[PDB]
Amino acid sequence: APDTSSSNKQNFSTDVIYQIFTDRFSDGNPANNPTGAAFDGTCTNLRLYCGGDWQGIINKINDGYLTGMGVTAIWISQPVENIYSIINYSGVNNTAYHGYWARDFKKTNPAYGTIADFQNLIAAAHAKNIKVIIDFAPNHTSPASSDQPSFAENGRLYDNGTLLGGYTNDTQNLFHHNGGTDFSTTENGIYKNLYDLADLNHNNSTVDVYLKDAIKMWLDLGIDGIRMDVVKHMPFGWQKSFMAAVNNYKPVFTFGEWFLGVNEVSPENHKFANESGMSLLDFRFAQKVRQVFRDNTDNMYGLKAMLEGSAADYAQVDDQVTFIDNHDMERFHASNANRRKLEQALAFTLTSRGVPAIYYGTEQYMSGGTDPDNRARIPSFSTSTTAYQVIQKLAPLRKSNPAIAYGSTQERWINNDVLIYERKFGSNVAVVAVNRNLNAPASISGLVTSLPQGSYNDVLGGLLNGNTLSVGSGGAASNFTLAAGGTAVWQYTAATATPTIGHVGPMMAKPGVTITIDGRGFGSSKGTVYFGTTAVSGADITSWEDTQIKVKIPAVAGGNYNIKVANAAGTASNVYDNFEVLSGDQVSVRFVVNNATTALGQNVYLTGSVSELGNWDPAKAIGPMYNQVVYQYPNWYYDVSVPAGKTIEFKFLKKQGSTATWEGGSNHTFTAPSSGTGTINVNWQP
Ligand SMILES: OC[C@H]1O[C@H](O[C@H]2[C@H](O)[C@@H](O)[C@@H](O[C@H]3[C@H](O)[C@@H](O)[C@H](O)O[C@@H]3CO)O[C@@H]2CO)[C@H](O)[C@@H](O)[C@@H]1O
Ligand SMILES: OC[C@H]1O[C@H](O[C@H]2[C@H](O)[C@@H](O)[C@@H](O)O[C@@H]2CO)[C@H](O)[C@@H](O)[C@@H]1O
Ligand SMILES: OC[C@H]1O[C@H](O[C@H]2[C@H](O)[C@@H](O)[C@@H](O)O[C@@H]2CO)[C@H](O)[C@@H](O)[C@@H]1O
Ligand SMILES: OC[C@H]1O[C@H](O[C@H]2[C@H](O)[C@@H](O)[C@H](O)O[C@@H]2CO)[C@H](O)[C@@H](O)[C@@H]1O
Ligand SMILES: [Ca+2]
Ligand SMILES: [Ca+2]
Numbered sequence: 001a002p003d004t005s006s007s008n009k010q011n012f013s014t015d016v017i018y019q020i021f022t023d024r025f026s027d028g029n030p031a032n033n034p035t036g037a038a039f040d041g042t043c044t045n046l047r048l049y050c051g052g053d054w055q056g057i058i059n060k061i062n063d064g065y066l067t068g069m070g071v072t073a074i075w076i077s078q079p080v081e082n083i084y085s086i087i088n089y090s091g092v093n094n095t096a097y098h099g100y101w102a103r104d105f106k107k108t109n110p111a112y113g114t115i116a117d118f119q120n121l122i123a124a125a126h127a128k129n130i131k132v133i134i135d136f137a138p139n140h141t142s143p144a145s146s147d148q149p150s151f152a153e154n155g156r157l158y159d160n161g162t163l164l165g166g167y168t169n170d171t172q173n174l175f176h177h178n179g180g181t182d183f184s185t186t187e188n189g190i191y192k193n194l195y196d197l198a199d200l201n202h203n204n205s206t207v208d209v210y211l212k213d214a215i216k217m218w219l220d221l222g223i224d225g226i227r228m229d230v231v232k233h234m235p236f237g238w239q240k241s242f243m244a245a246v247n248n249y250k251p252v253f254t255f256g257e258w259f260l261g262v263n264e265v266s267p268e269n270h271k272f273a274n275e276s277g278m279s280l281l282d283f284r285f286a287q288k289v290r291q292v293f294r295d296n297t298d299n300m301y302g303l304k305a306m307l308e309g310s311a312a313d314y315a316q317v318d319d320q321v322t323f324i325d326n327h328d329m330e331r332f333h334a335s336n337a338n339r340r341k342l343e344q345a346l347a348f349t350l351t352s353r354g355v356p357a358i359y360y361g362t363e364q365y366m367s368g369g370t371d372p373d374n375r376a377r378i379p380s381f382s383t384s385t386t387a388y389q390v391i392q393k394l395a396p397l398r399k400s401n402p403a404i405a406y407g408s409t410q411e412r413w414i415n416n417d418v419l420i421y422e423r424k425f426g427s428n429v430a431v432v433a434v435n436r437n438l439n440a441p442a443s444i445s446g447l448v449t450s451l452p453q454g455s456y457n458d459v460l461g462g463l464l465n466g467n468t469l470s471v472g473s474g475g476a477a478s479n480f481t482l483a484a485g486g487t488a489v490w491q492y493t494a495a496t497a498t499p500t501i502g503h504v505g506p507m508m509a510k511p512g513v514t515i516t517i518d519g520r521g522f523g524s525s526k527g528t529v530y531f532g533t534t535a536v537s538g539a540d541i542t543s544w545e546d547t548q549i550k551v552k553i554p555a556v557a558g559g560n561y562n563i564k565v566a567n568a569a570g571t572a573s574n575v576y577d578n579f580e581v582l583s584g585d586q587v588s589v590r591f592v593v594n595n596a597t598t599a600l601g602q603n604v605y606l607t608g609s610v611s612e613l614g615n616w617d618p619a620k621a622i623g624p625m626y627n628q629v630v631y632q633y634p635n636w637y638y639d640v641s642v643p644a645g646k647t648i649e650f651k652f653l654k655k656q657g658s659t660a661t662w663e664g665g666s667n668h669t670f671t672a673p674s675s676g677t678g679t680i681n682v683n684w685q686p
């Protein structure tokens with residue numbers, strides 16, 4: 001099948017995700033609606049269930065609302081069973097309509113539907129070539145009070161009906177009891193509760209195995225992707241072992257939510273996206289888009305910097321899920337704002353790198369402040385809004401023009417209010433011009449592109465006051481006026497002669513797992529696939545066609561490899577780097593080192609005899625480790641994904657910059673558990 005196929009669970013760069021708050025989209029089955037104080041059919045009280053369910057999504061998939069819009073994927077509220085409690089927060093009732101208060105990860109939320117409903121949703125979506133992404137929040141269960149077990153459902157956790165435990169009398173230690181986080185440090189936000197939500201303890205073997213079994217159930221139901229909740233608040237090491245469990249079983253596109261505020265650029269964020277096994281929601285992108293197109297707190301130079309910067313900071317910038325708003329921000333469109341601002345931001349997102357996500361209702365110009373005002377019931381299913389048409393004309397380009405799905409990004413013209421950028425991939429080009437200035441035209445002269453000579457009609461058909469472009473030889477465009485608020489798109493597509501890799505997924509797995517290599521020019525006959533210097537050809541290449549290769553990871557030593565392919569004739573393609581071959585199945589192990597004194601700015605790291613520990617390379621050591629919550633300085637700890645059942649030798653390092661001080665004596669040694677979790681506690685050897 002082609003890279004653009006709806007059965008491609010490893011690549012969403014050619015797709016356009018429609019984010020659905022299930023309860024606020026469409027009530028297709030009144031029978032499963034909550035009752036009494038937990039419900040409001042007029043959806044006036046935005047904190048109670050309104051009725052939106054899976055049958056409603058099924059209906060909107062079948063009657064063409066999403067299809068006609070160009071949406072090829074949907075991201076829905078967490079499907080697992082939530083608590084039924086109606087929490088009174090300072091006189092205001094609240095329900096689990098949002099689905100973030102899980103109680104049983106192996107059951108569905110009856111308000112959304114039954115298992116069978118979920119199955120029908122998967123079938124209906126797939127029958128219309130629409131992938132399905134589910135929210136999954138393994139960080140916590142639900143609101144709880146340690147010294148007041150009658151509050152809500154005490155954050156109780158069930159395993160397909162069987163009670164595992166609650167927050168009160170947590171003798172099994174299923175949850176954390178370190179208080180609540182103030183978000184002061186990453187460590188503080190990971191091992192303490194988010195608000196009053198019972199924080200699950202992933203170092204507890206029961207919780208670890210439970211969650212991994214849970215996701216498998218959903219993978220077996222046919223989901224095509226996963227949206228991980230508050231990933232900045234779970235041990236990164238455990239999450240990596242979680243992604244390995246997923247990828248070593250049934251890999252699906254996974255992205256986590258790591259909030260970034262205005263102007264925030266986080267190296268940690270980058271590292272997590274580059275090494276965890278999942279990508280992230282592109283907040284850096286979204287926040288900059290808001291500044292530039294919505295709030296007027298930065299200009300195109302800032303947008304350009306974000307694009308060039310993120311392209312350098314993210315190893316797979318193309319896996320980042322972009323958006324202009326969501327359920328935790330005020331709607332992009334302000335009631336008294338010019339609608340063109342939302343339209344331009346939309347056009348920009350749909351033609352930029354990554355995986356665009358559109359918050360339901362955006363195409364209907366929904367306005368609304370912070371939660372819950374941004375979660376109103378969609379007021380209309382009209383296909384006649386300008387925003388709907390914008391998405392309709394641009395979303396399909398991600399499928400037909402690989403330059404938009406996998407292309408590089410280059411600024412070709414710019415000033416305070418104007419940005420004309422170019423996307424390129426093989427014999428494919430797309431040029432996008434945007435003028436954020438709603439009252440001032442822009443005279444564009446000197447624009448140079450990679451577009452072949454000729455005349456190009458605006459793909460938006462002038463919908464956003466775009467214009468026709470005239471390109472001479474050398475790709476130089478002749479002078480033109482870019483209208484106020486003008487937005488235009490010009491493109492060129494043709495067959496690519498040389499093998500070009502535009503995407504690889506998953507990016508982390510053990511030998512034997514099948515990965516997907518997408519792009520153009522691979523040819524119809526099986527060629528060769530390279531993992532570093534290692535050549536793979538023949539039978540281990542399960543299937544091969546011009547835009548997609550399905551190949552099994554060779555039994556090479558664990559490590560980081562460059563992926564490359566060659567066609568039947570032997571012509572090599574570009575290199576897709578940063579692929580991680582695991583050393584085998586993974587288990588999460590907490591490493592603890594005592595009496596490791598340091599000077600300010602100096603931190604302790606972990607290094608060892610397996611790639612998962614950086615194979616003794618200081619620059620690849622795990623850390624910096626923690627020393628605040630679970631253990632206090634001079635004791636340090638860190639949860640790490642390591643190969644199950646392997647005997648591993650390790651040591652700890654004290655690093656400042658790239659300068660490293662090694663533990664003295666002999667290597668520490670231990671054997672990772674075959675499954676479940678583990679903890680190794682040792683002393684620092686001077
Ligand atoms: O590089 C692979 C090896 O990495 C580890 O070796 C560490 C030692 O653990 C560490 O003590 C340090 O050894 C130095 C030693 O302290 C000093 O007396 C001597 O003069 O120089 C040594 C360095 O050459 O640094 C090495 C890394 O170089 C790991 O313990 C080992 O098993 C790996 O084979
Ligand atoms: O002509 C090549 C040149 O094109 C663009 O430069 C623009 C510039 O961005 C505008 O602000 C204005 O000054 O017109 C210039 C073209 O005459 C590219 O930005 C630039 O890098 C490139 O060399
Ligand atoms: O907790 C984070 C913090 O840990 C280390 O700080 C130590 C410091 O090195 C010791 O000399 C002593 O002052 O205790 C501190 C922890 O309370 C890291 O050195 C520091 O960079 C890091 O932020
Ligand atoms: O009860 C606390 C809040 O829980 C949810 O908030 C979600 C948020 O929507 C999601 O994007 C983020 O990743 O996780 C948090 C907590 O799971 C509800 O949406 C809020 O209304 C609640 O106040
Ligand atoms: Ca319903
Ligand atoms: Ca947590």
Ligand SMILES: [Ca+2]
Pocket residue numbers: 314315316576577578
């Ligand atoms: Ca890369």
